[PDB]
Amino acid sequence: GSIKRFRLKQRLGKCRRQNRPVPHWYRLKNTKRRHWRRTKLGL
Amino acid sequence: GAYKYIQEIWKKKQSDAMHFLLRVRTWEYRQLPVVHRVSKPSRPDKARRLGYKAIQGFVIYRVRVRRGDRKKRVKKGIVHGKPKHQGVHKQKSTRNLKSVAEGKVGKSICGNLRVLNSYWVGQDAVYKYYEVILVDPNHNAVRNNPKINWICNPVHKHRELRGLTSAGKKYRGLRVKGHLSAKSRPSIRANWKRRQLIKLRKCR
Amino acid sequence: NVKAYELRTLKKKELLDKLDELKKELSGLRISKALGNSAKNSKIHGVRKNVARVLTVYNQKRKMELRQLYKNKKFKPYNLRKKLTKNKRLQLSPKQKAAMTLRQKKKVQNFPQRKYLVV
Amino acid sequence: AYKPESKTDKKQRLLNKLFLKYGINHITKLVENKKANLVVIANDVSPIELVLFLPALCRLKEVPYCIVKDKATLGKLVHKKTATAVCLESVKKEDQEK
Amino acid sequence: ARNPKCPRIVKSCHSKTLDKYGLIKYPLTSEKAMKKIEEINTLVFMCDKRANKKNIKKSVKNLFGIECDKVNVLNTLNGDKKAYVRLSGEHDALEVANKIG
RNA sequence: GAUGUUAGGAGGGCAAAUCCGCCGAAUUUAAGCAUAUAAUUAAGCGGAAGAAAAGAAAAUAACUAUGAUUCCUUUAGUAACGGCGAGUGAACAAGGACCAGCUCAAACGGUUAAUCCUUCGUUUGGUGCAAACCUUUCGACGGAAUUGUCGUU
RNA sequence: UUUUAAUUUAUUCAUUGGAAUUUUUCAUGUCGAGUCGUGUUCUUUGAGAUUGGAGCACUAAUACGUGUGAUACAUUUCACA
RNA sequence: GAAAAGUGUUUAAAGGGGUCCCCGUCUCAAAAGGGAAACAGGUUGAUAUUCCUGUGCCAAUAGUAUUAUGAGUU
RNA sequence: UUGAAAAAAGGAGGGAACGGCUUUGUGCUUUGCUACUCUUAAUACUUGUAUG
RNA sequence: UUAUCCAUUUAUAGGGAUGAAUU
Ligand SMILES: [Mg+2]
Ligand SMILES: [Mg+2]
Ligand SMILES: [Mg+2]
Ligand SMILES: [Mg+2]
Ligand SMILES: [Mg+2]
Ligand SMILES: [Mg+2]
Ligand SMILES: [Mg+2]
Ligand SMILES: [Mg+2]
Ligand SMILES: [Mg+2]
Ligand SMILES: [Mg+2]
Ligand SMILES: [Mg+2]
Ligand SMILES: [Mg+2]
Ligand SMILES: [Mg+2]
Ligand SMILES: [Mg+2]
Ligand SMILES: [Mg+2]
Ligand SMILES: [Mg+2]
Ligand SMILES: [Mg+2]
Ligand SMILES: [Mg+2]
Ligand SMILES: [Mg+2]
Numbered sequence: 001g002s003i004k005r006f007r008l009k010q011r012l013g014k015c016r017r018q019n020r021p022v023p024h025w026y027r028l029k030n031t032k033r034r035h036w037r038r039t040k041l042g043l
Numbered sequence: 044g045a046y047k048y049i050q051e052i053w054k055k056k057q058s059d060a061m062h063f064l065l066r067v068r069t070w071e072y073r074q075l076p077v078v079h080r081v082s083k084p085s086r087p088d089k090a091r092r093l094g095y096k097a098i099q100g101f102v103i104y105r106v107r108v109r110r111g112d113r114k115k116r117v118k119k120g121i122v123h124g125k126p127k128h129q130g131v132h133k134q135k136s137t138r139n140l141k142s143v144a145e146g147k148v149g150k151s152i153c154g155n156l157r158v159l160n161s162y163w164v165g166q167d168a169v170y171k172y173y174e175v176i177l178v179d180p181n182h183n184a185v186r187n188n189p190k191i192n193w194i195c196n197p198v199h200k201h202r203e204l205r206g207l208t209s210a211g212k213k214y215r216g217l218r219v220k221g222h223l224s225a226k227s228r229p230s231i232r233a234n235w236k237r238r239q240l241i242k243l244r245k246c247r
Numbered sequence: 248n249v250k251a252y253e254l255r256t257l258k259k260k261e262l263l264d265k266l267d268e269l270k271k272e273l274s275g276l277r278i279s280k281a282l283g284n285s286a287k288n289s290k291i292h293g294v295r296k297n298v299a300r301v302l303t304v305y306n307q308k309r310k311m312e313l314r315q316l317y318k319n320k321k322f323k324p325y326n327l328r329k330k331l332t333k334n335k336r337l338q339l340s341p342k343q344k345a346a347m348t349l350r351q352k353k354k355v356q357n358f359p360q361r362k363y364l365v366v
Numbered sequence: 367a368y369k370p371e372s373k374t375d376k377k378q379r380l381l382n383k384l385f386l387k388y389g390i391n392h393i394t395k396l397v398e399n400k401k402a403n404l405v406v407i408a409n410d411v412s413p414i415e416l417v418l419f420l421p422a423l424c425r426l427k428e429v430p431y432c433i434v435k436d437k438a439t440l441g442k443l444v445h446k447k448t449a450t451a452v453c454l455e456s457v458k459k460e461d462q463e464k
Numbered sequence: 465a466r467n468p469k470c471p472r473i474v475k476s477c478h479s480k481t482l483d484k485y486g487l488i489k490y491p492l493t494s495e496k497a498m499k500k501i502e503e504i505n506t507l508v509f510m511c512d513k514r515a516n517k518k519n520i521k522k523s524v525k526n527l528f529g530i531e532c533d534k535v536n537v538l539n540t541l542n543g544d545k546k547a548y549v550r551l552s553g554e555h556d557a558l559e560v561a562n563k564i565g
Numbered sequence: 566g567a568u569g570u571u572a573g574g575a576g577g578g579c580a581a582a583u584c585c586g587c588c589g590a591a592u593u594u595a596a597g598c599a600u601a602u603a604a605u606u607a608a609g610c611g612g613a614a615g616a617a618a619a620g621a622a623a624a625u626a627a628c629u630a631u632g633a634u635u636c637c638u639u640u641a642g643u644a645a646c647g648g649c650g651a652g653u654g655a656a657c658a659a660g661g662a663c664c665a666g667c668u669c670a671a672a673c674g675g676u677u678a679a680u681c682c683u684u685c686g687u688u689u690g691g692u693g694c695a696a697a698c699c700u701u702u703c704g705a706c707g708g709a710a711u712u713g714u715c716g717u718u
Numbered sequence: 719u720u721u722u723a724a725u726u727u728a729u730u731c732a733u734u735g736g737a738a739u740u741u742u743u744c745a746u747g748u749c750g751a752g753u754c755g756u757g758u759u760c761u762u763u764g765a766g767a768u769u770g771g772a773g774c775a776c777u778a779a780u781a782c783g784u785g786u787g788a789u790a791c792a793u794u795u796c797a798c799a
Numbered sequence: 800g801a802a803a804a805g806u807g808u809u810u811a812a813a814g815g816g817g818u819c820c821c822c823g824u825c826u827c828a829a830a831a832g833g834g835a836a837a838c839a840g841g842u843u844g845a846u847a848u849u850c851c852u853g854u855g856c857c858a859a860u861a862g863u864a865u866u867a868u869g870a871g872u873u
Numbered sequence: 874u875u876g877a878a879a880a881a882a883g884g885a886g887g888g889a890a891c892g893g894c895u896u897u898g899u900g901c902u903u904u905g906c907u908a909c910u911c912u913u914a915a916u917a918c919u920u921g922u923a924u925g
Numbered sequence: 926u927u928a929u930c931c932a933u934u935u936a937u938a939g940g941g942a943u944g945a946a947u948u
Contacts, residue, residue: 003830006539009539009541010543012541013540013541013542013543014543016541016542017542017543044391044394044395044398045390045391045393045394045416045419045420045712046391046670046671046713047671047748048394048419048420048423049415049416049419050671050750050751051419052415052418052419053415053751053752054751054753054778056751056752056777057752057777060418061415064414064415066928069928070927070928073928073929074810082412082566083412083413083712084413084712085412085413086413086415087413087416087712087713088416088670088712089750089751091669091670091671091713092669092670092671092750093669093670093750094669094670096669096713096714097681097709097710097711097712097713097714098681098682098709098710098714099681099682099683099709099710100682109800110773110774111773111774112759112760112772112773112774113773113800113801115589116588116589116800122590123590123591124590124591125590125591125599125600126599126600127599127600127601128589128590128591130760132760133759133760133761133773134760134761134772134773135759135760135761135771135772135773135774136587136588136761136771136772136773136801137586137587137588137761137762137771137772137801138586138587138771138772138801139771139772139773140772140773142586142587142801143801146586146587146611146801146802147800147801147802150611150612150801150802151576151577151802153576154575154576154577155574155575155576156575156576163751163752163753165752166752167928168774169929171752179574179575180575181337181574181575182574182575182682183681183682183683184681184682184683184709186339186343187343187346187681187682188681189346189347189348189351190348190668190669191669192339192343192346195339196339197334197337197338197613197614198613198614198617199613200612200613201586201611201612201613202612202613203586203612204585204586204587204611204612204613204801204802205584205585205586205587205611205612205613205617205618206585206586206587207585207586207618211585211586213771214586214770214771214772215585215586215770215771216769216770216771217619217620219623219769219770220622220623220624220786220799221622221623221624221625221786221799222624222625222656222657222765222769222786222787222788223765223769223770223786223788224769224770225655225656225657225769226655226656226762226763226764226769226770227763227770227771228618228619228620228634228635229618229619229620229634229635229636230584230585230586230617230618230619231605231762231770232584232585232586232605232618233584233585233617233618233619235604235605235606237636238654238655242637242638266478270483270485270486271485273485274485274490274527275565277489277490278490278491278564278565279565280490281490281491281492281493281510282491282493282565283493302478305478306476306477306478309476309477309478310476310477310696311695311696312476313474313476314696314697317470320470321684321685322469322470322573323470324470324471324472324473324474325472325473326473326474326475326476327474329697329698337575342700348668349715349716350668350716350717350718351667351668353736353737354737356736356737357736357737357738358737358738370675370677371677376677376678379677384676385675385677387675387677387711388675388711389675389711389712389713390711390712390713391711391712391713392675392711392713393711395673395675396675411712412712413712416712417712441711444711446710446711447710448711448712449711449712450711450712451711452711455675465569465570465571466570466571467571467572468572468573469572469573469684495844496843496844496845499843500850503842503851504850504851506850517925518922522922536849536850538849548850550850
């Protein structure tokens with residue numbers, strides 16, 4: 001909830017970062033997305 | 044000559060003088076911690092006859108082992124399989140008590156050292172007491188000396204744990220050569236494997 | 248853009264000074280990036296590389312100095328020692344392995360394995 | 367008086383080029399060979415066994431033995447920290463009587 | 465008391481531990497930070513995750529003509545520390561903002 | 566004997582196909598099942614190496630005798646074991662691969678431990694651009710060691 | 719580049735030390751004990767009055783000894799270790 | 800105990816307090832038990848007993864030397 | 874059924890120890906003079922940068 | 926009784942005749 005350990009917080013942040021979509025410019029030279037409600041991080 | 048004399052003395056064992064000594068010594072050992080360093084061999088001659096030398100890196104450790112069989116390890120006395128395998132209590136171990144003694148010192152207590160050998164020292168009804176001769180393979184005194192040097196090699200890590208010490212050789216049945224021991228030689232398991240082996244031949 | 252061959256000749260203080268300047272520049276670039284700019288965003292990479300180069304040069308100089316300081320003297324720091332697979336380090340030196348008990352040596356000297364051409 | 371040479375003395379001798387004999391193994395050999403004339407044994411050794419046989423042996427071989435109080439003192443009598451026994455086979459004529 | 469004949473491990477390399485450049489990474493824009501700069505002379509800096517308040521203060525002192533009364537920090541969910549730095553009354557954050565960029 | 570963040574070192578964990586120790590089942594087969602069988606297997610626990618283990622006879626033969634170990638071809642599905650049921654089951658010899666022998670202990674040397682190691686050194690070399698290595702013999706100052714090091718067989 | 723064969727050049731002078739055989743004397747030495755072994759238990763083996771191992775009890779002999787020679791034993795050869 | 804593990808003063812030479820004596824397993828286990836100290840108003844698109852203004856509170860605060868503040872002693 | 878513990882704090886009992894400066898002899902003793910022992914707060918200066 | 930075993934404590938004086946208690 002609203003009191004995390006630092007490690008957990010960092011993990012959450014990491015997950016969030018992972019979430020974001022392919023930078024579109026790359027496509028000129030993703031399947032692991034997760035929606036917070038349907039698939040859990042299972043931490 | 045001296046060592047011959049002490050050999051002869053120790054052969055007697057049940058003779059009054061020797062008996063008294065044994066009684067004292069075993070009593071003393073009963074008190075000390077189960078595995079503990081000793082400064083000098085208690086049986087110098089016997090130590091010598093094994094591998095012992097008064098070189099810097101050689102150490103003797105006195106070790107105590109409980110006597111008797113080891114109950115078959117099972118939660119409660121009950122075993123769940125066929126009757127042939129059902130008994131506990133008269134289950135005698137394949138290893139010698141001597142082997143056990145050397146194992147316990149060699150393994151976690153003196154992982155640094157290399158077990159060379161071990162000799163008998165004393166016994167009561169509860170415990171057998173062995174002195175185990177060990178050697179520090181990193182001490183240069185041992186590294187340099189060409190006889191003994193061998194033990195510095197990495198193939199001799201934990202000889203005691205692979206049944207390669209004299210006691211190990213005994214219970215592997217490599218002490219007996221001949222028709223009496225045909226079935227165990229390169230190793231019992233190895234022999235078994237060999238005997239099982241089906242060799243086919245590509246051509247056939 | 249400063250490549251190493253120029254920097255080897257420089258003294259350590261000078262190198263340090265250079266490095267600090269480079270770092271400052273990098274910081275400036277970062278600040279610019281953070282603010283709404285993309286003018287010299289691509290300049291940063293080069294600067295970073297330069298910094299790295301400088302660090303490398305200085306580090307090697309330092310190592311050399313250390314080596315010079317601890318030349319011989321039996322024991323040394325474990326860094327400046329021969330970093331090498333543990334087993335190898337443990338292992339007996341070839342000479343040690345060779346070393347023969349005196350009688351054996353004598354025997355070898357006397358009756359060496361001869362060459363003898365059979366006809 | 368009959369101390370053995372110390373390292374330095376030995377070195378000097380080597381350069382230039384009757385005493386107490388020690389060590390139980392040597393001493394037993396000596397006694398077995400009727401060479402020894404007096405053996406002096408320490409009171410306490412950690413395995414008593416390493417020396418127990420010795421006085422009996424002496425009694426058989428008709429050689430004089432005496433058990434002396436300190437191992438460390440015996441060692442001192444030579445150049446070692448300790449010593450089990452010490453033997454004098456031969457002696458200088460001026461002292462033989464003693 | 466130790467007296468080693470030589471030390472065990474001697475890192476001859478330049479220190480890896482974070483200097484001013486590396487500790488404090490960049491100021492924040494964003495409307496919030498701009499507002500802060502305007503109204504209450506507080507400069508917002510993104511910093512390394514392993515910056516302390518003391519450390520941040522030191523960095524600020526070194527990197528700019530800044531004296532800081534108080535520094536609040538927080539760990540962002542992007543793996544950066546955001547340090548809110550309130551300047552002493554002698555300084556105008558706006559002027560210092562201008563100076564920095 | 567404890568004690569030391571004393572000086573120097575070592576062990577610990579990962580990995581496992583082969584390998585070495587233990588520990589150790591049962592399904593299964595027997596048309597049931599209980600000894601047997603599965604199997605000295607699986608799992609478990611520990612330990613090594615480029616291989617491991619074994620190895621220089623307290624060996625086999627009964628010959629005109631062989632001669633460490635290992636492995637292959639065989640002996641042999643034989644001798645033997647076995648509710649003599651199911652099933653299990655070697656060894657010697659023979660033919661090869663490969664072939665290597667040894668050192669402690671004990672005996673001997675006291676007109677002297679000759680041994681051994683730590684630290685500090687000293688000065689010829691060799692390859693290297695350096696880094697490092699490689700060897701060379703010479704002392705000291707320590708210790709260790711006569712409860713036994715070294716040489717001799 | 720790696721090494722390891724063949725081939726090419728050794729010749730003078732120093733002496734400490736060791737080795738092998740060969741004579742001839744004299745020495746008949748030493749040879750691993752709670753170990754082997756037996757009993758008994760359990761295990762393992764093709765091993766059968768127990769193949770190896772182990773626990774326990776008892777516990778040896780000195781080379782003319784002790785150990786193998788696949789049936790328990792005695793009395794004794796012989797061979798091999 | 801073959802180890803893996805199983806037990807935790809059972810026969811220990813088991814770090815603190817004073818000026819040698821005197822104490823004495825270690826460590827984790829409470830975001831509802833124990834416990835140093837905070838309130839109000841304001842402010843943001845999204846934070847606030849956490850920022851702002853104001854007003855306090857708690858715990859530190861090494862030595863040496865001045866200052867002041869008061870006590871006590873002559 | 875009688876209803877946690879400890880950190881931490883406090884109080885009491887007890888009476889260890891006892892001014893400062895200057896001079897002499899081997900921390901201790903002797904000789905001579907009167908601002909002293911506390912106490913908060915501020916200030917200054919060296920000591921790693923002495924407030925969260 | 927010395928092995929062994931059990932207990933007890935800070936291993937605290939060798940055997941007999943509703944205050945304080947420490948340097
Ligand atoms: Mg949660
Ligand atoms: Mg859900
Ligand atoms: Mg079993
Ligand atoms: Mg915070
Ligand atoms: Mg390991
Ligand atoms: Mg069936
Ligand atoms: Mg069926
Ligand atoms: Mg059925
Ligand atoms: Mg397995
Ligand atoms: Mg091998
Ligand atoms: Mg075969
Ligand atoms: Mg056939
Ligand atoms: Mg079978
Ligand atoms: Mg023999
Ligand atoms: Mg079976
Ligand atoms: Mg036969
Ligand atoms: Mg806690
Ligand atoms: Mg609470
Ligand atoms: Mg809200």
